[PDB]
Amino acid sequence: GEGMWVPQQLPEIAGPLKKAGLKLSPQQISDLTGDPMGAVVALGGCTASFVSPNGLVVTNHHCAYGAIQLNSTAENNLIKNGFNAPTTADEVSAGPNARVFVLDEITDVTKDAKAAIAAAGDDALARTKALEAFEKKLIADCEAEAGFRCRLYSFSGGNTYRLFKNLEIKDVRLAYAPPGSVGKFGGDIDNWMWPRHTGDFAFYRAYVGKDGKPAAFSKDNVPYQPKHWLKFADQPLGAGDFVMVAGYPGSTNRYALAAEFDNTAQWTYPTIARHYKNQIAMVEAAGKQNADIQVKYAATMAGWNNTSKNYDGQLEGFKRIDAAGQKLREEAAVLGWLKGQGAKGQPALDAHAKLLDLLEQSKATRDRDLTLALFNNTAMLGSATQLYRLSIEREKPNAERESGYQERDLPAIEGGLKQLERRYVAAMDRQLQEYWLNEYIKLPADQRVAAVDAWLGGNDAAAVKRALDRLAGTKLGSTEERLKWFAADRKAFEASNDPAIQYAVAVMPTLLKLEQERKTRAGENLAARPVYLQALADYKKSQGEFVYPDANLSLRITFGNVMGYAPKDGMEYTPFTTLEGVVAKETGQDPFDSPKALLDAVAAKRYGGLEDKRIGSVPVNYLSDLDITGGNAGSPVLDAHGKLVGLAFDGNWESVSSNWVFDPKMTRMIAVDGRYLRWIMQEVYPAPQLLKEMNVG
Amino acid sequence: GEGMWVPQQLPEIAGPLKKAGLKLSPQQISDLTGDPMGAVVALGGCTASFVSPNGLVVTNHHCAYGAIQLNSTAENNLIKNGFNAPTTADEVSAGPNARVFVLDEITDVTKDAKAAIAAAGDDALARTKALEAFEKKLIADCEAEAGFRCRLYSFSGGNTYRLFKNLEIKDVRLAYAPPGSVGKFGGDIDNWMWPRHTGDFAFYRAYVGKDGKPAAFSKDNVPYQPKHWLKFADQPLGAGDFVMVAGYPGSTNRYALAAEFDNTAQWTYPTIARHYKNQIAMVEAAGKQNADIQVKYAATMAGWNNTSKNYDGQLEGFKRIDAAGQKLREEAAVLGWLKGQGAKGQPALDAHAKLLDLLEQSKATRDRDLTLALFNNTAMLGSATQLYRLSIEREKPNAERESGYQERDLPAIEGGLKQLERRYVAAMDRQLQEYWLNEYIKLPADQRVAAVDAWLGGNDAAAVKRALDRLAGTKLGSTEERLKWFAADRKAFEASNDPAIQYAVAVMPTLLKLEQERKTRAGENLAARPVYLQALADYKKSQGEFVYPDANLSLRITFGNVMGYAPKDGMEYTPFTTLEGVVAKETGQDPFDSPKALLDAVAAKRYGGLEDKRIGSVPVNYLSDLDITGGNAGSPVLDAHGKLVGLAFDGNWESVSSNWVFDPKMTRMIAVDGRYLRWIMQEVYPAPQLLKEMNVG
């Protein structure tokens, strides 16, 4: 059911947990470094979990796909064939940027955070600056012990702050991946869809140095020995059974004001989807003649195509359930209730009014803010603005520098400059500059920027065509040139007659103002947001409900049951798929082309001891009413006793609105059953050593 | 489950009945004139049932559609608006050809039948003639009492013969029909499909004369008073509940030899579907310019389009389940078993061999037999051959005349001659003569008919074009001319220089030979068929199974349970549809255009006391594993206590092979729930008087 619950509040929702089917105490699962939550690790963008005392880590195949790809060549194509390391020495590096973060300590720092906010008071902008400041110092201090990465997270509008210190494992090796036609069966056709038949799993192993401290890749490293790890279920999972997921959902906005929501649904999402569709059109079209354009923009267009399709999906989902109506009605009920109280209710009504003010402020300049951001996200101008900005930031003490522009950020920046080249064609990027300058000249005139008009030398298509011509003389199309500028101080920027650099110098005063306008609204949100949210929580209590905080990249538990859904009268989606269903989709050309050993095993009914009696086959994937979102890929699904019964890997189409709502009747997670993991590793692409290692061989 | 059981064998299948859920004794439902089977009536082509002591009869809306249409004008359009008779005087005639047949007496005449076959022995053709003879006399005698129609039916290859004497009610009036957008919701789009949301019901009332004997329509008639009638369930029907249907399925061929089946599936069905598709192509094409062609051929093309689509459906269903394989395997097992016996098994092996002989005989001339039949089914030549044939038959005593060509048949013949005109255009029919003559010249030469080649004056396209030209001089395109010939004796036929008539005179000796070849194979089938079938029954017993006879237009009981099916992994069709599902399909243009009072009632949740708690709405249609086929439309669905819970009206797509197999996992009947009948009659198109009459008002 609905909710991304923090571990610390589990004892408080004991009754609902118990009622859903949980058999462990809330106390035991409320311990983030205990059994089993201390087994759950973050990979940065994906969830994963320890599954052996010798550092074996399980996650999705699409989470590991970069690692797998990195180790693949046409000659030895792991993507297609799968990968299996018979001994730990056979295991291959996932790359320098691969991580496993294991929780080591949590601290509640709410009082210190709130003081640094308070003690620098009344002034919104300075409130935002004092919180930044507090944060940068806390992390610096916490990260003084080498081998740790620390993060500070704010809950429910900054009602609570917690510091997480994580062991940062930096040598991650690939141990196993099924063939791609298992790990990605159905491809893009079956994405977001049920029925699903995708074996979306893979295994890493975590390594440390002989001294037990994190270390970069080295053949002197040895497997990390986790304190906790998960074990495979010994009871079969069936329809109605309790399940729970632990993972790191990135963000939700479940408590947004009705007007905030209307703004996104009526302006933000349609606007961004239109832009993205337009840029896609132009890449494909340019792309059919070049061929260099269509290879270098390929990932770019895929990213825009996802978001475009995602937003369009959400917008349809909103209509389906009248999202904006329900939000309006609930909100009226909360305001009604607050008026209900006396003087007591006034603070929350104020906070609400203020939030509505802040919303109008940001709406006044929304076309401009968006257009400018995306224009500055084109290759030569992004490059120019980022580097000039770095040059300004470099002149303050590292501690006073803007996050993203610090010592620690420098390798990431330098890397993007190089990476840039793989996705940049001058002819293409000029069409994209054109596109965005034309969006800028079409803005409502009250959101023009005098600075930008000044640099353009006007505000119509003729000024734009001139500026494009002027800009084609930049040298920043060259990686050398960009690293040159990477090194340059700001007087060099302000003396440059390179037209990309002159743009950056001309717009930066404006970019900085807008930044400080954002931080000012944030400083205000800091005061009003927790107060409004506290009142939502109070009103929920009065209806006997519990509340959970919006997701914020911290570990959460969602719980519920295995169950299907019915999108139409006379029909139901059943909670499980089976082996025979994989085979019935076989074409086999991509993406419905299973390995021959799979086709044969299912044809022989070689179920390998894993058959579930209730469905009469080995289950493949399943549906349940858990509440997950981006960041939960790879998350372990556990049963009523804390044992591993699957991995989260996708949602059904009706999950696409997870940022905004949860629909008890239709929102479902799609998991791959742990029995399918085992079956694949027994009968199709065998990993006897790993099964032996996990006590199921 | 599988089986169309005759009432007399129900006590013998007591255990399976009891186990499925039946709560009445087998004894009670085995009585064809008792409670409730004596309520079930035949309409000629459709099933129906008495539902009141005052003669009210319920059936499907598509069964009553002719009656409804007959009473409709553009001004007063019952098809669209529905019809409701507030008093019995408001009830309107269903037409002179409408019937309700009520069972009055059954007799087992097996011994007399078998004697007349035996006593005229050894000779196959004469066996066929003696059975014809026996039959014509039995019926004549039985029908001596005015007001009765009698029928003789042969069971399991003529192992048993029963005589049914039925009261023939001839004044049938329409009492109620819902609007067409209920009675035919979904139209042709939802035909053969689930999910289904069609209120396919209508009500007649049966009338007799003031003396209680059948009579043709007259305002002096009064309602017939049936001895038994059905009552509406007082328990809600749910998933898994026992259901049974009683009705008059026309024909099945469940025990066909594997080779008989291969012949149909590999030759008959594909051949006929091809022909029908070709003739359709030519009607549409000619039809777009005429407009008179496309109106007069409209029903013709619909008939060909059904059969074509039906056959294509069956052929796909056969592949889906490997029908030909299963038949082969079962058959091998039966032959195996028979060899298993000693001398005892030899008669059945002989019978089988003989059946296989008879099959080869008919296969030797199958292209010819088919081509000639369909050529003689064109308007001018059918007309010519039927009338010449009548002229020959007229010269023997009525008793010795061929069935179809007797005194009793004469009005039917005269009517077709007139009706002909509504579906005949000379230009069109000439293209159809052309089509068929070209099929004839393309035959394998070993199936040519010297007679036909003789009349053509050759056997190629030039002879065909000449014959078409010759034939366009017929006068039989005129209804007058045809009635003229209706009256004519055979010397007049044999002296005619009308080219249609000259064809008839030239081919008749051949048509008569082929007829006698058919009756000869039949006479043989009479001896070998029951013996093979008896051995199938014996082999079934040895596996502990019961056997049912192929359908033959007599009353049968099928039983089973309410249940869905799952055509694909991860998905199921649920056994019920609901009101909200009707509304969710609303477009409303035809055929998804429900009455506004339906849309409003569902929107208000005016469930009228009929809501089933398990589904949370009023059920609309449901699925079950009963075994029905053509003739079962309108059949009452009864529950475990013999109460009315619905009417059969269609099958799911996987039912399309009902003539040949039954698939326990996929074959389903679609019924309209009796609660939906009541709901429509309470909330949408009200019939309070009828609900009061049936004790649910």
Ligand SMILES: [Zn+2]
């Ligand atoms: Zn237990």
Ligand SMILES: [Zn+2]
């Ligand atoms: Zn442990």
Ligand SMILES: [Zn+2]
């Ligand atoms: Zn099994």
Ligand SMILES: [Zn+2]
């Ligand atoms: Zn009872």
Ligand SMILES: [Zn+2]
């Ligand atoms: Zn009765």
Ligand SMILES: [Zn+2]
């Ligand atoms: Zn209700």
